[PDB]
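Researcher: Let's try something more involved. This one mixes different molecule types, so please make sure each is placed in the same coordinate frame as the others.
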Amino acid sequence: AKSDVKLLGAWPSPYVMRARITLNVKSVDYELLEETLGSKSDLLLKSNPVHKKIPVLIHNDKPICESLIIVHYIDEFWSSGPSILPSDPYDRAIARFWAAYLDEKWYPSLKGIASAQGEEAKKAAVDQVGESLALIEDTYVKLSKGKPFFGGEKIGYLDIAFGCFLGWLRVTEKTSGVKFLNEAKTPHLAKWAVRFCADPAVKDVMPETEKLAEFAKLLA
Amino acid sequence: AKSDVKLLGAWPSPYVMRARITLNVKSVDYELLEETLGSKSDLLLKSNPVHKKIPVLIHNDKPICESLIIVHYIDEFWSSGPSILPSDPYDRAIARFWAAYLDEKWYPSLKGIASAQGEEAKKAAVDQVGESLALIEDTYVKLSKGKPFFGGEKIGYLDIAFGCFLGWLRVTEKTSGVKFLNEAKTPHLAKWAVRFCADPAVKDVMPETEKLAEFAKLLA
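Model: All components are placed in one shared frame. Result:
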């Protein structure tokens, strides 16, 4: 409820979006407090002194930090609602593994295209993103087992962990002039991404591409 | 068993040690395959193509990667054995949070002392480690609630996540000439570290300090 669940967030953040989608799945209402560009609020600094990052879930006045940990916490506290994590230990380990991969390696590589200077660096950064999408496509085929989502019949942990970046992916495609996730290159992910963005827990917390692209300009 | 559980490891690795301690707690026997310095084995390259890192747990011929995920997997698959993760959702989130902090921020800062050039850089790196130990000491007091371990009566997730680094901490103290974890500065952690290293799941997989210090020399 808004009385007992607060989320320190910011609408462009893919990490924050993970927390919002998961709360939606669990039918948990919450208040969302927006951070402003270029400064961290005193409330954020107080609630996440270690990292000073969003999201922060404040549940009954206790702060929980790090989006993937927050997603676990929401799944575990609100355990009677639809499950986010897979039920099987091996499946769980694999979903956790790919989410950690996305944060550690994949997402940082998106930004690397804009940062690259010169043709060899640009080609390298663009090629890397393409190679990783090929890996993620293969992984999707393996994990989904023919079902609509990474998590099976309904969105799960890995859908949320990857799908939270789709807005920034689309912006990166616009600015790089290369389409990475599409029918030709990643036909399975292409169908999945339409379904994911149409999911009622996702549809209104996923930023429209041009709006995010405008924000990307305001960014410095 | 050795037939169905293999661990790609290396005796100096704190990350690998997490997997060994957890298997020990669960009374799960396993075979350990050592990586050699300066090269990755073809078996490692095949079992962890994404990161090419140890540890890798190969359980019934399925590889699982990333030490903290491996610790979760062992806890969850071997669920009838002593529990590693806390039972409460909030406690779980907090233990996960501090383990992630240790890997992201704390452990990298240990190496920064040796890497620093000049007095201002050295002082900065040494001071940072001291500040973080003060934070970890406070966290220990809060989480342990007077019990011997972060996890309470028995070693738990966060004991394993922090304690796995004690060998490298002692080596860093030797090479930096500054003691960071001791009675004077961190009296609670000082008592805890003796108890942790004496635990039967830890005692023989924790490298003796001089041996690790010698390895640190062989390192380039």
